[PDB]
Amino acid sequence: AKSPTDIGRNLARQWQRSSVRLERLLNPGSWPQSLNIGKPSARLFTDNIQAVLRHVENWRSVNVGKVDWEPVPISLPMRWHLRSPSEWIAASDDPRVSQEYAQLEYLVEQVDSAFHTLLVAQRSLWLTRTPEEVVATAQLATQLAPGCAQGRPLRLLAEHGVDTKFFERNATLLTKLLDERFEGAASEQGLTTFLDAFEESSHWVLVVPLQPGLLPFKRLRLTTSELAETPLPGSRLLVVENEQCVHLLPETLPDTLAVLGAGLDLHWLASAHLAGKQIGYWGDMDTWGLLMLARARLHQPAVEALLMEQELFEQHSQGNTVVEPAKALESAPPGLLADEADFYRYLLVQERGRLEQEYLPKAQVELAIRKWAR
Amino acid sequence: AKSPTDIGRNLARQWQRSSVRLERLLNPGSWPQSLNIGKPSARLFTDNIQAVLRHVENWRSVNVGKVDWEPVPISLPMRWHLRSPSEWIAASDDPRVSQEYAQLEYLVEQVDSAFHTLLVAQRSLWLTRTPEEVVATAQLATQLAPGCAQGRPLRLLAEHGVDTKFFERNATLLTKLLDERFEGAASEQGLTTFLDAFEESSHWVLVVPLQPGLLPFKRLRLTTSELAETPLPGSRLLVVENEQCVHLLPETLPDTLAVLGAGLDLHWLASAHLAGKQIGYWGDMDTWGLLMLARARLHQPAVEALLMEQELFEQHSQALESAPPGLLADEADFYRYLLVQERGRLEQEYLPKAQVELAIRKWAR
Structure with a gap:
């Protein structure tokens, strides 16, 4: 013996489930839907006959749909028959449900x-x-x-x-x-x-001072556009292709800043502020990395390549090397030295050379940075 | 009249469709799946009887499932009955499909x-x-x-x-x-x-100084861990929720710093260096903004809210069940007012610069 308000409250609760909504909207076979009402209690009928009288009269005032009627001697409703979704929504009697259906119905047909x-x-x-x-x-x-x-x-x-x-x-x-x-x-x-689209907002790069007292902070992050025309403290500068190999860098180094994760846009090098100091490059050992080194040398004719030597490949060959998915170029790019060109041609012939920056001994990189800074 | 290889290729292509895969796996009543074979050409039958002969003993080597028979005088197969998914995979004759089913079946039952x-x-x-x-x-x-x-x-x-x-x-x-x-x-x-889980690192925020000489650079980006250890220059701070509203900020202000894009993480505010500093928090005007302002005020009791008055919201109109701790009486009433006032969401970006700069300079004393 559920009141019509109870069914409306129960219907609203059901609508909150994703399975119910899909069944009601994207399935025309969902209709018809019949809701059971329920017989009243015999004990309550004898004790309080007005209890069922108000109950049956309360069902006399419903007009949203059609209610199944059958005699029992007082006739009591036992089923509710709702055909259209408009009847169903008007049965819930909840503004949130009503407005949600209106928005969903509009979106479905569009x-x-x-x-x-x-x-x-x-x-x-x-x-x-x-x-x-x-x-x-x-x-x-x-x-x-x-x-x-x-x-x-x-x-x-x-x-x-x-x-x-x-x-x-x-x-x-x-x-x-x-x-x-x-x-x-x-x-x-x-x-x-x-979508293969690039966002040219700032291409943020990581700036790390390798000596305390050079910058107010310890781990900065600047933009290429700002770096194009901003003076930089320190008489040295080191460029690192990779982003997360910062731990491999020495914990200290005199008057030197590191720009990790530079990316492909090595166009901020050509500036008045940059000229005057020594610039070293330390990137991946592959065709792409050699292209980056060539671009850096073209922009500044003083780029001292670091840890891009053939013997490093020879000794660290049996580490973790993979095959480059796509050749950066079919010939040695211009701007590199004769040794760099020979190393590029050497790297071309091997089927598997992708010695990354991460897979390197810390001690050797330490000594390389020290000798570069010497 | 298709050879079993042709149907196998046809089935393999159908496997590439999402609807077919859902029908085969997530519907036990999908089975059976009967595939029509097809009648041969009468002209081809008369011209080359061996051609249709070749066709039938191409069907003499099939044992993946069971083939339906009807006599026709030579009898040709019309229908192919596939009962089980194992028959379906075996009929596909594709290594990629076979291993894909093994992974899909293993994952689903787990x-x-x-x-x-x-x-x-x-x-x-x-x-x-x-x-x-x-x-x-x-x-x-x-x-x-x-x-x-x-x-x-x-x-x-x-x-x-x-x-x-x-x-x-x-x-x-x-x-x-x-x-x-x-x-x-x-x-x-x-x-x-x-999930309300902000890592100490990798949570970079935008710092834009508003006065030359205070900071060596123009625009920065520091992790929230750095902001909780390094002393900050200047004497005033201005925290903003939305990062993409720096244009609305004024040009210059004496001894001010703007930590845009703070997000939900504001635990860095509780620091010795930040103590004794006049700071202000300009977040959005919604439930989340008010909760974030409460969290900020919990760490620092001297936070002065900006652009949160009910008048400002009412002139531009067309979380917890109760008020969260850390709200003044007017702001606490504003939280309940915005709770049931239609769709109470309004971003900072929709605020004209005429009054924003005026309010900021009003605070900037």
């Missing part, structure tokens, strides 16, 4: 069919975002392909919906939508890498 | 049923990772709750699977598994933010 399942079961994705943004984002996802940018800034990828702040408030939604179109590839690789 | 749908249709997630990692990560996902760390590092959050790089190679999988258990809450907030 957003593509492949995206219907995700949006229903992931209410948090669209709860904060306006319906216009979700529809526009879903349209953009359908017309994107892996590596579509192929080296273009993310601003220009948007056809018309570029604005100024659109992407950083829709990157999470765009990643999830692309995941179910490309079998979860966007989440694994990342939206930035998946 | 991993909870809540993630069965995701793994089947998102083959790229488990394709690269070892089976042990996926099983262990799924177990961790079923045993996690929002804000479980509640101010603890992620290293100790792991029950046993901490290792050294385990999360860095499994953060993406852990986020996706948590999302379907919590209705996509991990992806929106971020796994680090969702």
